Ligand binder design. Sequence first.
Ligand code: CLR
Ligand code: CLR
Ligand code: K
Ligand code: K
Ligand code: K
Ligand code: K
Ligand code: K
Lengths: 118, 119, 733, 118
Amino acid sequence: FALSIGALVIYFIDSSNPIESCQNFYKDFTLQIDMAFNVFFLLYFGLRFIAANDKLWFWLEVNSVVDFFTVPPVFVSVYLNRSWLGLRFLRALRLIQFSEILQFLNILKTSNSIKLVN
Amino acid sequence: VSNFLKAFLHKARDDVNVEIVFLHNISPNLELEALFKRHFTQVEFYQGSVLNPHDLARVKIESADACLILANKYCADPDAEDASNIMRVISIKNYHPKIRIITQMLQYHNKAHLLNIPS
Amino acid sequence: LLSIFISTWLTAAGFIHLVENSGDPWENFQNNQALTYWECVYLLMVTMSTVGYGDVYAKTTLGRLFMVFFILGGLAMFASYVPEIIELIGNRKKYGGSYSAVSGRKHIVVCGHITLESVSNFLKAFLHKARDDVNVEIVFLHNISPNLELEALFKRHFTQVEFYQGSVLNPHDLARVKIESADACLILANKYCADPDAEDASNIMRVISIKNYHPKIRIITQMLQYHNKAHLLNIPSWNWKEGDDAICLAELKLGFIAQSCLAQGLSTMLANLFSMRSFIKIEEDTWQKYYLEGVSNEMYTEYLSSAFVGLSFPTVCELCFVKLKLLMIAIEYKSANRESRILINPGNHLKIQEGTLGFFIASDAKEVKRAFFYCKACHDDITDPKRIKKCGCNVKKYDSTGMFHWCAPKEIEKVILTRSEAAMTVLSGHVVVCIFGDVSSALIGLRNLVMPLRASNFHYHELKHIVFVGSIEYLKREWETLHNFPKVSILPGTPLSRADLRAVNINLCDMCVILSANQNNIDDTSLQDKECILASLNIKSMQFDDTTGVNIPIITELVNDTNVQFLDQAAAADPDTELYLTQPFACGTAFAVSVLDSLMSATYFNDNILTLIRTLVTGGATPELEALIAEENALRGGYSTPQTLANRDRCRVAQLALLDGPFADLGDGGCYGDLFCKALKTYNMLCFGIYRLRDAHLSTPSQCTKRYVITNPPYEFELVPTDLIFCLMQFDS
Amino acid sequence: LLSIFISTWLTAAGFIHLVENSGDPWENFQNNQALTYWECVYLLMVTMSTVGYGDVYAKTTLGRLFMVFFILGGLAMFASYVPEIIELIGNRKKYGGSYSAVSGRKHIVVCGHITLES
Ligand SMILES: CC(C)CCC[C@@H](C)[C@H]1CC[C@H]2[C@@H]3CC=C4C[C@@H](O)CC[C@]4(C)[C@H]3CC[C@]12C
Ligand SMILES: CC(C)CCC[C@@H](C)[C@H]1CC[C@H]2[C@@H]3CC=C4C[C@@H](O)CC[C@]4(C)[C@H]3CC[C@]12C
Ligand SMILES: [K+]
Ligand SMILES: [K+]
Ligand SMILES: [K+]
Ligand SMILES: [K+]
Ligand SMILES: [K+]
């Protein structure tokens, strides 16, 4: 979730740039940490994939779709050395899990507050 | 329900991983719904009937640790309540004969009926 | 409301027009905006809808101020006028209206006690998957608004079932449901009420209203008490010959129980005989396959061909069984002297007349028309049934009618036995009726249980003693209709007490019948069977010495089908098993009343089924006896005359064993067809079913004495020595 | 209720007036919009009614941000204050009142057992 928030902030910063542009990997620094987040997302997706009782239902969830629309395009960008804004905003859907974290850190106790935060 | 939760869910109780699932066909009132919401992390409620095998399948009675049956201590005819509890025991044992049952009986002469159940 | 809205709209539009076209006075009228009146009307409508395009708007200070005030005032006015809009919308009547008739689409109307359980049972019995293609639409008529669950039940069957709110007693509501073109009207009774007489009177009033609106409509009604149906004879338009029928729940149920007392498993056979069951194929060597080979049979009526005229009944029955593979049970003898009467397996002295109706038991209705298109000249040589074509080439001992055993009336004090007195006498081969009665409970009409067991078709020494175990307060209210029967005794007590059961020698009785009377008091429908199930389990667990109560034959009345599996000690193989496939039902040890709800359906598609069941089960009650009972509300004795003694000769239901009888040499591996033919030819005996030990196909020995029912086995069906045969035995003197 | 509504309306209008006339600080106050206080009052009333002509609107970044926050807060406040509005409307007595006598028009009064059949 923290890396998702970081990716959302990076997208917010990058939105000012043109939609299509070319930028060197070695010269740029933000794209490096963007790929650092993206490879962690890919590893997490693979770990959920191997620990799946049914592959179809796991393959038709919103998190998997966000991963599909986030990680293959950044691999294409690093391969072709050209950047496109794309659907990087979909990472914001991770905010739907936010309330659960507020239950993990004992912040929320009442169910009404939990469902309001949700 | 309040007395049962006070006796069962106690602070001094050691770490126990038992979840309580209530099964009753009467819709709860506001105060008892608030009582459930106070213990939503450990207590669940489902509307259904013990005499209906489908409702027993809903609450996963085939994997439950035990079934606890409470009696109506304030009734005009204790014999009718005892017979209803015996019928509930019979239905539960008919669905799953290997489950452990702890029941409440009002009159002492009625519990002998529990010896008539083969299971 | 519309006038107020339009006037406010026009006034506001004109005022905006004035302030916009005039301009601000302090600006020397230099900020005026050219804006027509209709453009201001458009602006006001765009504003009040909270759309606000912004293509036209107020530019002056006064215009903007007045627009702000108009927005505030319009919001306040709309908030104030919402309740009147709600009242104009109103509460729509969900079930008001009338039924829309469809050409070529018959409909029936169901009224009376319209609740969840009754409607569910009626739809289960009527709308069945195995039912053939029938274009009948069910229309329910009741004045009480349904609850959520029953509305969902209607929505499940919205393509075939409709509901309309109304009253039968109101002719307008009868006109709404198009009762003048309905096929039939079915009236359901409230089986759980404090006063059955009031419910019967209400049903009779509904019948009277329906017949007053349309005298030619067919009516099938439910009656709670047996003595009330005579009121239906007071209606001049009630024609029994045209299909109007009354089904007495207590009479039919207690007759089924009594006939099962005479021969266990008969209630199961009858219930499966007129009920539509889905076909299930089982190949494993169990008792279910042998049971399902007999479940498939149904009951039909057919007109005998002219080739059978002049032949005796046994000859025609043998020809039907051997050639046409049909079991012909009964005929309808028509004599203008005595109207028409259904004769159950008449003797060889009677001959088939012209155009006589006959009752057959057959797997399918297509194979029933054989008895109508049978000609000896062109079909005798044919062996395969399917190859046959339609080619044509001093002291009173009996009652007034002499059909029931009768005795002098006696006080209830002469039949009450104490526990010590009951233990002193020895009772063996008797009937024990346990009753969960009460002083304030509704009467169940115990006479309907005693009359079939006290029929004149039995000898005096063959009569079974009846011992009623229950509250004496309830039994005193029923003794006025039971004091004219020879052998009836009362033990005041409780059926749940083991001492009372041991006093009446429950281990030696031929049958124990458990009945409940406190069904209306319990609000929950599934808990209405607690006392009967507890009594059955208590009796099955008793111990005896000279050894256990598991072998005691018990018949238990149950309201809910799902409780029937509670009578089997073995664990349920599947809690979703259908009622007819359960072991207690297949063995005849349980009687679910819901089969009566099926009988009405069987009555709708064939009116002769109810008459045949009444004349087979109730002991042979005649309309003359009905009229006499209506006149006197009791049974009147009479001296024996040759006419009444000739009226004594009938046929009775019995079970026979093959261990040591005349057919013992055939029960060891012989076929059922030879047994049937020999019984029909020699003793004029009609075999129609096998009561077979459950653990008989198993090679290993077993101690289980439970038996199941096989209805009308084929000719090549094998026989084992440990079998019982259902039969209709002639009266012998 | 009316005092709360009017005070909130006036305060929001004045705050919008300040942020619009002052201009954005990071733009060196060059995007300021000449907008009188009463025009801001008009804008707030048009916004709160969900009409939105668009003849006047906030052009600065701060103005648009504060308009978004005011829309959210106003929707939340209205949703919270609906029950008090319902209580003010109340349950109208349908059959309360008095009979209005008409000259030359006799009337009789029927009382006792007033049911449907009677
Ligand atoms: C209930 C109503 C009738 C009473 C309220 C008075 C209203 C209708 C009066 C008071 C002030 C008036 C305005 C005063 C000044 C001007 C400028 C002039 O060119 C005529 C129109 C116009 C714009 C007037 C229109 C009518 C007006 C708004
Ligand atoms: C509860 C309230 C009082 C506290 C919140 C602080 C508010 C009122 C403060 C914080 C930041 C402030 C703004 C910061 C910058 C400018 C530019 C300058 O030309 C003055 C106005 C304006 C636009 C200020 C208006 C007031 C402001 C929005
Ligand atoms: K709107
Ligand atoms: K709008
Ligand atoms: K708009
Ligand atoms: K607009
Ligand atoms: K059948």
